[PDB]
Symmetry: C3
Subunit: 191 residues, 3 copies
């Protein structure tokens, strides 16, 4: 049941990778990293030391999970999406002491080639469209697109838009499962 690791991958002494996880070609994981069970890390992923990745997190090719990135259970990182840890980098000024956290909450989907400016929290089951640039917190269930990203709707856990306004108070059901969502002052939650 131990994690399976491609022979071309480099997992540095000390790293913790949970059962049933799968680590693919030319992945490098630093020794501080903690990765849960049933994760998948695609070709050329990088993982830093100051990183916690939960269970069943699927990370596509070419994603660098840097120090100060935290991924909850069931997060999806699409191909070539990009995390950061310094807000205002300058090569002349080492900013390793100024890292900002990026927290991605359970079930959030980070679309292909999106970018997340450090300091943002991405809420539970949020959905960041392909290519978006996130530079503010993303509410639970929010669908955001564009550069920079702006909220255009709400996404059910299953991954389809809810017939719910952005603002105010309202209720709606998932078009697939029928489960109910409540909007209260512009914040969406599961009933």
């Amino acid at each position: 049941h131990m994690a399976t690791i491609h022979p071309t991958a480099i997992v540095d002494e000390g790293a913790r990778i949970g059962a049933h996880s799968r680590i693919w070609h030319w992945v490098h994981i630093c020794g501080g990293a903690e990765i849960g069970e049933g994760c998948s890390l695609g070709q050329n992923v990088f993982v830093g030391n100051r990183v916690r990745i939960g269970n069943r997190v699927k990370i596509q090719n070419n994603v660098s999970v840097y120090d100060n990135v935290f991924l909850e259970d069931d997060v999806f990182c699409g191909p070539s999406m990009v995390f950061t840890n310094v807000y205002n980098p300058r090569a002349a000024i080492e900013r390793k002491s100024e890292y900002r956290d990026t927290i991605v909450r359970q079930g959030a989907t980070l679309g292909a080639n999106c970018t997340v400016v450090c300091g943002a929290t991405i809420g539970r089951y949020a959905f960041v469209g392909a290519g978006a640039v996130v530079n503010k917190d993303v509410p639970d269930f929010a669908l955001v697109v564009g550069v920079p990203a702006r909220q255009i709707g709400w996404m059910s856990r299953h991954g389809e838009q809810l017939d719910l306004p952005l603002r105010g108070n309202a209720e709606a059901t998932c078009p697939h499962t029928g489960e109910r969502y409540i909007l209260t002052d512009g914040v969406c939650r599961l009933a």
Copy 2:
């Protein structure tokens, strides 16, 4: 010296079909189901899935992952770190391997550096997707599209320069490099 073939660091899985005179560079991984034509170039860290067909003289720059259900015709150009997809609405907790949508890129299309194509879109012959655009709808033959999301702003000749053609209606234009004539018919561009 000798012509480069397949860099020794590449991994080409048993079964892959690669045409003559193609060049596969450092730390490329090609899956066993893939078919790749003649005269192609695959840059550093390319990935190619199993359910993939790539034509002839397809030039793929570094860091492009040609996933299952992407199909590239002859003379397609994939710019550095452009991005294909195959699931429209991914959720880690919901496996969607039976829900892949095709991305078909027709002959001569150019996909600019760091663009992204949302699966399901078809990219027309000799289309031109500007650097960093995000394509989420079909792109007509010859269309020049830019932006997030991508919008059509012009028409690009086979040579790769804008044609003096309006976006809609009927019109004609000539490429000054080749003298090739183009006809627009109710907003659809073709070579004469």
Copy 3:
């Protein structure tokens, strides 16, 4: 320079003291890299490339032929350079490369893209994800697709209290250094 054993640095490449080359980097034999640089995972460097001193290049950056990086340039993770403006696979355009010159202290944010031909000014700052397709003035802060200027960044890397255009003066509070905006061009006084 210190070079990870998985990196491939082709014979002829010049790499200065105190530089660090990380996992599965490939550097071509014509490249010139200065002192105190850092090249992250899977970086690629072409032959017709000059990279100055103390240039920090994060993972997944391809520094292609005709890209020139001055000292103290920062290239963020997965940012993207180009060298052909209008590529077509059928038409080899290796003779038509356009230069991309990135001047001293400029920062290229994560996952930005620079269309070849642009010059990026000294201490400019290209926001994460921007697509640059025009020259970026010294100290300009630009964001968006395509990139548009929204302010001015000090060397330290925080916005200066200057109008977007016009004539004005400002001081960096971290260093006390003075900036002068003359006819929309910012400089150190």
